[PDB]
Amino acid sequence: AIQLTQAPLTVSASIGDTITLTCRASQDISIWLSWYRQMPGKAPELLIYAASTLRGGVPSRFSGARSGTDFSLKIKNLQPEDFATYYCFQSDSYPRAFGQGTKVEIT
Amino acid sequence: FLGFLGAAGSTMGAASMTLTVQARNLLSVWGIKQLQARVLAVERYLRDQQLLGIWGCSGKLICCTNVPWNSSWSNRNLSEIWDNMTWLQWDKEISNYTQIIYGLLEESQNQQEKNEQDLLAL
Amino acid sequence: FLGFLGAAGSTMGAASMTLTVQARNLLSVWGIKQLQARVLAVERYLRDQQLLGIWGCSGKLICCTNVPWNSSWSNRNLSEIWDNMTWLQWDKEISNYTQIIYGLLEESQNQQEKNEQDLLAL
Amino acid sequence: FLGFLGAAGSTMGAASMTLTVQARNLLSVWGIKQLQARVLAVERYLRDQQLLGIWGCSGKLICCTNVPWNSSWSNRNLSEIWDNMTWLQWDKEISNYTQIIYGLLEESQNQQEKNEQDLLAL
Amino acid sequence: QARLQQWEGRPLKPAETLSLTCGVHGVGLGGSGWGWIRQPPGQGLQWIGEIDHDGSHKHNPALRSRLSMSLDTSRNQVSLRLTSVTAADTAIYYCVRVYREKFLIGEFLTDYRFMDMWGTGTTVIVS
Amino acid sequence: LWVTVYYGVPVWKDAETTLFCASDKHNVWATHACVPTDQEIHLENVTEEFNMWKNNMVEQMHTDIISLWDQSLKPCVKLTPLCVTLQCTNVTNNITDDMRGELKNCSFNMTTELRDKKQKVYSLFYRLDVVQINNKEYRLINCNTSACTQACPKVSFEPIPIHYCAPAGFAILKCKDKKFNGTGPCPSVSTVQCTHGIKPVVSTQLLLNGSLAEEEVMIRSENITNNAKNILVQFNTPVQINCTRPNNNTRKSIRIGPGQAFYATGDIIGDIRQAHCNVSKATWNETLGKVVKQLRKHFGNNTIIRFANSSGGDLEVTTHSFNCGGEFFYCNTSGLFNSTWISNDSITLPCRIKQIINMWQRIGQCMYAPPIQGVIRCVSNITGLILTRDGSTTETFRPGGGDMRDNWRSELYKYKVVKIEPLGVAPTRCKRR
Amino acid sequence: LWVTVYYGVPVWKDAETTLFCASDKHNVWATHACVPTDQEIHLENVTEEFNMWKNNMVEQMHTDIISLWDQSLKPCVKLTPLCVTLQCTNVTNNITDDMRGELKNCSFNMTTELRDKKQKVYSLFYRLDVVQINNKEYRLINCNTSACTQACPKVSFEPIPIHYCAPAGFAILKCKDKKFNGTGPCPSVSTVQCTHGIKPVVSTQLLLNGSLAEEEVMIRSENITNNAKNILVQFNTPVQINCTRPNNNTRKSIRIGPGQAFYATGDIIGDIRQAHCNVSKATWNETLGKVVKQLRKHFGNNTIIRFANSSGGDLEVTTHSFNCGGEFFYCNTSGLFNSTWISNDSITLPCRIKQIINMWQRIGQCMYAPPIQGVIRCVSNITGLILTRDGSTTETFRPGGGDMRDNWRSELYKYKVVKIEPLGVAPTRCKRR
Amino acid sequence: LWVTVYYGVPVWKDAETTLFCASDKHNVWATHACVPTDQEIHLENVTEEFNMWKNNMVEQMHTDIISLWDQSLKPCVKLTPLCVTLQCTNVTNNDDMRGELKNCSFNMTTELRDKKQKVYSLFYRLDVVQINNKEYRLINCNTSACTQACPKVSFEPIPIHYCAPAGFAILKCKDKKFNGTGPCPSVSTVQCTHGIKPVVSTQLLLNGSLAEEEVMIRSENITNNAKNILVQFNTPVQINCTRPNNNTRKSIRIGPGQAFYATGDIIGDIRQAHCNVSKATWNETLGKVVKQLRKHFGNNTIIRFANSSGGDLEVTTHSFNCGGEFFYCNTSGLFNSTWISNDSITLPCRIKQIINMWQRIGQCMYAPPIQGVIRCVSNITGLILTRDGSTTETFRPGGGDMRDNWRSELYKYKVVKIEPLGVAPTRCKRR
Ligand SMILES: *[C@@H]1O[C@H](CO)[C@@H](O[C@@H]2O[C@H](CO)[C@@H](O[C@@H]3O[C@H](CO[C@H]4O[C@H](CO)[C@@H](O)[C@H](O)[C@@H]4O[C@@H]4O[C@H](CO)[C@@H](O[C@@H]5O[C@H](CO)[C@H](O)[C@H](O)[C@H]5O)[C@H](O)[C@H]4NC(C)=O)[C@@H](O)[C@H](O[C@H]4O[C@H](CO)[C@@H](O)[C@H](O)[C@@H]4O[C@H]4O[C@H](CO)[C@@H](O)[C@H](O)[C@@H]4O)[C@@H]3O)[C@H](O)[C@H]2NC(C)=O)[C@H](O)[C@H]1NC(C)=O
Ligand SMILES: *[C@@H]1O[C@H](CO)[C@@H](O)[C@H](O)[C@H]1NC(C)=O
Ligand SMILES: *[C@@H]1O[C@H](CO)[C@@H](O)[C@H](O)[C@H]1NC(C)=O
Ligand SMILES: *[C@@H]1O[C@H](CO)[C@@H](O)[C@H](O)[C@H]1NC(C)=O
């Protein structure tokens, strides 16, 4: 199977900052890696698919990059609704896997 | 040369000159109609050749047998059969005596088959 | 009169007097199937008559030939073959020697064809 | 042993010792094709057997006949016919006269069929 | 208005059959694929299995022979039938739609499945 | 005397067998599949019994002609889409009082090559083809019984001569007696490999394009004393009849499917006139005089020979139905048979044309004859009649027909199929040694 | 001793050939194409090795019966317009409790003789013919596998005896031994021109209208110790079974196209009663006692013989599927096989009628059997069984079937086709001169 | 000297007859219309005259290959409902395979007569003709209805032996320099021919039999430019096919029991279908062809190979079947060279699903999509060239007439009729 490593497991920033989240894969999964955000108590929602494409309705602040192993997600102009747990999900090999989850909070 | 069935009206003596004329003319879903007529002619011809073969007459147009002519079949003298009658008239007169003659010819050959087979071992 | 295959269980000597009975019966969704059954009967009959003609036995039911009987084929004497065995039993014994005998008859007649061809040349 | 048509290039004298080889190979939607070819093979075989019958050559492969050779059909002597030519070369030479000879053989047999028939009446 | 609704199944006794059902409204079961995602408390998400557009059942290797899913095309419902439930299976179960978008790499075209639409949550507790 | 076996004797028995083709653009009677032709041997002293009324060559020919007809109509357009509701109005454009109400202008929704697209087309249908449902609504006459396979426009209906040749082992005997009534002994018999060119001309009440008698008009009936039997008259000299359809038809192709096309009458270019046939008044009167003279021989010299028209029944039996030019005519023939006989001018027979043809009296197997573009003119020979007598000092002969076996009985009357019996046994002084 | 060639010797060998039919309103197993019949020669001292389980006459008859079946379903109506949504309610009008929700009163829109027009018709369909699609909407049970050919109303399903006759050069050997078990040397052999009248009765679990044994009940299996092999029982005395369809069905003709009619059940005139078969309880119990007696000869005298009902599978194999009167019954024989055997009254078998029939186990070929007008009664003969043994001192036998070749293996067990080899060579004192 | 009759003489005449098939999952040219096989006899001193251009086995095999083709298509689906109006949109809306496809949506019949079915399929642009999401229709819809290529019968050619009936013999020319005509010093009587695979192709004789010693040029009249030239190679030129796409076949129920197989989706490598011919091997093969082709036109003449002139796509392209899907390759890089006294050649191939194979009108066939990637390995064992009517001779590829494909396999065979009855003089005299 493929293991996705997401670090740092807890990043803290105040409102109006820029954060970069890392999701490192085991093998090369091409660009097939989608990002999901889970607000505490709610259900996860799709932010980015194919590591670069923004979901319909997601603000332009969210953005991903890279098509190799070290996938990254960048958030600009932090707002209280962005302080949730983010997950990276690969779709290359049929034993699908999720990331560990990066809990973004306020300082 | 009279042609096929040309001597049909000739006397039995004159019609026997041309037995080879009729002999050679007995052998040669729409495809099946033609194809089934061809098979009928072949098996009809072979049954006549088989009959001649079992009478000891195979390969002969005129074959002499060892069956004496019983007068019950026809008591007319030899002069009024081969020079006065035609073959069509003759066939109608001995039509009912045909099958009993056929059995006698078959019984005459296999008697000669065994007698010659026995004599050949001496 | 026994009928078709009536002497199947009879001895070879007794069954050889009824060869004509079996001989005359070898010649004569329901369309081509019935038509190709007739063509097969003619072809099977014609290839048996061809063999007899090649061996010099055309037009005969009992054909004494010149090929001597190799004792290897069957060491039995005449008494216990023509009076103790049936034709079905006999066919089983020599079923494997049939093809070598067939070649012997085929070549023996071919020698007789040229022997009588040279005799007539004088 | 040469096989079927193997002696096609052999001289006429050498190729006449292998007649049994060619003789036995003349007899043995998409269903009529197979079936109509079989019926035509049987019909052709019977036409050539019928011709041999009306020439007095039934059941024979080499049949010496009573018809003299005119030398207007071929002026070559026996040495250069049976030891130099092949049956294919010879066939292309008397193809013109084939039906002339075929008529003489039939006529000679018919006369011979009755001369023998009239001889038995004594 | 397209939503996936699933309802609570109440706590269940250990070593039983876990029967889940997701209600698909707004869209229909055809064309996409439908799978199940769980989340143990205080942990990350875990993939259980999916049925792809072809009708072919991808299952997670960890849950061996105890997995079985079906699609109710008439009622537009996705079912889960996890068996022999152990205390470690206490998690919130989500029903997801793996949607296929074709992304063209330099010369290769792929069907990319990215779980477009998520359920609301069914807290399953076994005791 | 000893039995001696002769093989090849000239002896024949009467027999029935399958005779094959011979024939010296495709035709309905597929002579391309029939073998080519090539032979007359006179049989002196041979007197043979013939019977044209129990001749199996007629029954075989009837089956073969029917089988050749419904074989050329297998690879043809089955007009199932044509069975629709046809809103028909009367062509009243340049029509003659005679043609008033015979042609109908019928519009209908037809299918197209594309399954989801319809097509509003129109065609001029004869009144005999459409039956009204109760512009007014009509439907084709051939819709509660079957579907018509449209006659392929390339396959021709022209009767070309065919020869029925006996297989091996069979002979065809030809009675050469010129005054043969079709029954009894024939002093002049000849054998042929097969017959003269017999054109399968399909017609009723009048034998067109047939064979003429040699010396005098021949009246051949199974038995004259029975009125229920038809009378086959044969003329010694022909009466020519000029057929015509003056209308200038336009053939309009309608695509009713992928492949499948339907040819419809579009519009008559010019005046509308009735189809008709012309028979010379002088020639026909003379021919009936010869018919009556040889017909008095069976009814007495003092009898009164009256010719009336057809009694009644289907349009095929009450009218001189025939086909030439590709259109099927149905001519009245009541001016032909109207006279009582005691001991430049022409006769015009009004003809009606159908396009939906039930040809061999078969029901459930129809054919739509596509319109022939242009004007059809046709000149043929009346070489016979098919009369029927009705049960006083006068006898009334009305034209008959219907049974097409009588059409080909007038050509196969002189032929007989026999089976050669070549094996014969006779006594002779010879003995086998 | 020299080789002597004998032609015509009585010698044969096993061979396979195409035997041709012969037979002594049309029929499915067409006797018009079969040649008319005419014969038996006893062969003393002849012992022949028979094998009914490797007999090619059975394999050929299976092909011929199937071929005669689907060639008779070519010319008649193909019911492809009947694959429509039927809006079916239940018949509850006078239904008995047994036949409750078994007939469904289905209404649908059919095509008319006119293509553009539509037709609202209703018909009664058995529950076994319609499947629900989600008054409720149903559709015919075979509309996702194939379209179904209506059984032609003038052809007859009644079995007519047929005679399989060997061509020239072949012989049919008939085993006249009265205790023959189908395999092994038969010491009493005779040569027949061809076989007796073998009625092609299609059945299951019971051999109807067959041939009875001569002396005692005959048990025949390919390997009696193999349970996977079917066991063919043959009775020495028949057990008559009285079939019936008490409903007075009315046949209604629906014109679904040009020249095409669909025959639909109009309405039952009276009360709705279930079809059933009656077998005498005393006679059946007597016959099973005889069957068990000869069934103990292969399993022992102390073996407990148990008869159970069919294990499971299709309705054609779990039921006594048969046909008589034109309607196809599927009777429940769980009342005939329910007993255990240790060392005026009647049995009623509730049957079910079906109309879409696929009988040669060929998915993709239907046959819609039209309703039969009136009341059907039927009296047959149970002249055999097709048993199957379960895999202890107790043996359980269950009725079998499905494979139709076992039905005809019970008629052709005594026959054998041989090829005559008439060219024999034997030594003799002859020497050709 | 007297006439003596010999029966069984080894004499034969030229004849035309019906040769029966023989062969050793159903096929188009199946074994159910053939006979099981089982042989060759060398006829010494026999010099027979052959003529591969007036050979009736070629004319009969053409009839039989056609007949087995139609006979294999009658029992399966006829696509009359596929003539509906199609609402077709582009697949890419922008070099790829997807630029060759139209995404066509249409109403189709259901297994229930009164219900419709809104379905879609990807149709090649070569199969749809616009009607004036535009409106299209299948190309062979105003000419005929396309009987669907039945999915359980394979198009793979199996070898068939044409065997002569009784009374006939098949003469086989064993000469290795025998062009197509004239005497053949080495002749043999075979029971029947070697396994002739009925490979259907144009401009290139894929698979089949190689020459023995050198490339053979065979024309009916080499000086007539209207006659095709049948080149036969001595060493095969391997050609590799492909359709890189991973096709997804989709089933549509157009009626009771009838299914229509449609291209639902296309993913994977979207490079255009192509064939690869080794550039070094093809160059040395044309060198051998040119060397054997200057013998008929001169040593100083200029041999130039151009590409096909024009006409139908079946005649301007190397039409063939490979893996059940029909290709139409350009072969303009194969035939492009002028000859004076690791690398590969890629031929862009189009694909069609509606096939009018035997140069006929009114009988099309819908080849259903093949699931997955199609791969292909064939031998180019010959050519069919046409010459242009100056010191430069231009040889364009030819074809169209399928008989020249089987004329290249039945060139060495000849059917003769045995005449076993011959008369000759001898000193005999019947007694
Ligand atoms: C060749 O041409 C073909 C066309 O001829 C191409 O196929 C088409 O490809 C389209 C693009 O891939 C695809 O569109 C997608 O459809 C999604 C919905 O799926 C449909 O359509 C299927 C067709 O087979 C159906 O099987 C489904 O059932 C579904 O239709 C449902 O069906 C219901 C009946 O069962 C209807 O009724 C509902 O039923 C409920 C039952 O409880 C309730 O009663 C409801 O009240 C009732 O309405 C529905 O109305 C109907 N729904 C429809 C029509 O949508 C759709 O979700 C996809 O769009 C969304 O997602 C993508 C990706 O994120 C976004 O880009 C879009 O913006 C959109 O996102 C927005 O919504 C989602 C939530 O859905 C949010 O998460 C997101 O944030 C956004 O807000 C998309 O439209 C076509 O369906 C398909 N058509 C066919 C015929 O197959 C083919 O690809 C082409 N091929 C090639 C090779 O080129
Ligand atoms: C007809 O009979 C006469 C008189 O007997 C005879 O001269 C003539 O040859 C016969 N004709 C034929 C053809 O036999
Ligand atoms: C026909 O004429 C012949 C010869 O006179 C005669 O035998 C027969 O009875 C006649 N038939 C009729 C019907 O008059
Ligand atoms: C049938 O009888 C033969 C001969 O007695 C025997 O060999 C064979 O085993 C028997 N078959 C059964 C099933 O009993």
Author numbering:
A (entry chain L): 1 to 107
B (entry chain D), C (entry chain F), D (entry chain B): 519 to 546, 570 to 663
E (entry chain H): 1 to 82, 82A, 82B, 82C, 83 to 100, 100A, 100B, 100C, ...
F (entry chain C), G (entry chain E): 34 to 57, 65 to 78, 82 to 138, 147 to 185, 188 to 309, 312 to 323, 323A, 324 to 397, ...
H (entry chain A): 34 to 57, 65 to 78, 82 to 137, 148 to 185, 188 to 309, 312 to 323, 323A, 324 to 397, ...
Original paper wording:
Comparison of the 007 binding pose to poses of V3 glycan site bNAbs showed a distinct mode of binding, most closely resembling the V3 glycan site bNAb PGT128. Antibody contacts with protein portions of Env are mediated exclusively by a 22-residue CDRH3 which extends outward to contact the conserved 324GD/NIR327 motif on Env. The CDRH3 is also positioned near the gp120 V1 loop, which is located adjacent to V3, thereby allowing 007 L100AHC and L100FHC to contact R151gp120 within V1. Interestingly, in gp120 protomers bound by 007, but not in unbound gp120s, a portion of the V1 loop is disordered suggesting that 007 binding destabilizes the V1 loop. In addition, the 007 CDRH2 packs against the N301gp120 glycan. Cryo-EM analyses revealed a distinct binding mode compared to canonical V3 glycan site bNAbs that depends on the N301gp120 and N156gp120 glycans. In contrast to classical V3 bNAbs, 007 binding to Env does not depend on the N332gp120 glycan, rendering it resistant to common escape mutations.
On the HIV-1 Env trimer, bNAbs recognize highly conserved epitopes essential for viral entry. Here, we report on the identification and detailed characterization of the new anti-HIV-1 bNAb 007 targeting a N332gp120 glycan-independent V3 epitope of the Env trimer.
